[PDB]
Structure 1
């Protein structure tokens, strides 16, 4: 039920700061209770790679 989507990303491409999540569906019976976003509590790779 808490479906997890692994973000696919190449390290050769520079990182990006995610801001919003759009979920699209065409069937009317899909009901969403809540979306989330998993990040690193250790390091942030955007503030250093300016």
Structure 2
């Protein structure tokens, strides 16, 4: 599931809202969702495998970004799952409202004798 966004911002977290866990009524296995952030430079950043629970309806996936590496804008989110009973109502991107960390990294007379 490839979801695009109008304004490419940083991704503090990815909110994935589901209405089905994907669990079949005859199978006891749990269902996992894998989320890859996509940049404006078309690069995939893995966010890992997460199980699906109705208790965690708006799944919050926290993006752990290394502060030495530069921040990057996020354009698309690819959610990869291997179960056809999984349903997603909407995918959200969480950003910082006060600042954009990507673009932020971009008088009298003085007399000396």
Q: Same fold (TM over 0.5)?
A: yes
Shift of 1:47: 1.2
Distance 1:8 1:49 in 2: 19
CA RMSD of aligned residues (A): 0.7
Distance 2:58 2:103 in 1: 30
Structure with higher Rg: it is 2
Distance 1:47 1:13 in 2: 14
Distance 1:14 1:8 in 2: 13
Distance 2:92 2:76 in 1: 10
Please report the TM-score for the alignment, with normalisation by the length of structure 1. Answer: 0.92
Count of residue pairs brought into register by the alignment: 50
Shift of 1:48: 1.8
Unaligned runs of 5+ in 1: none
Please report the TM-score for the alignment, with normalisation by the length of structure 2. Answer: 0.43
Q: Which has more strand, going by share of residues? A: 2
Greater RCO between the two (CA within 8 Å, min separation 6)?
Answer: 1
Distance 1:17 1:4 in 2: 19
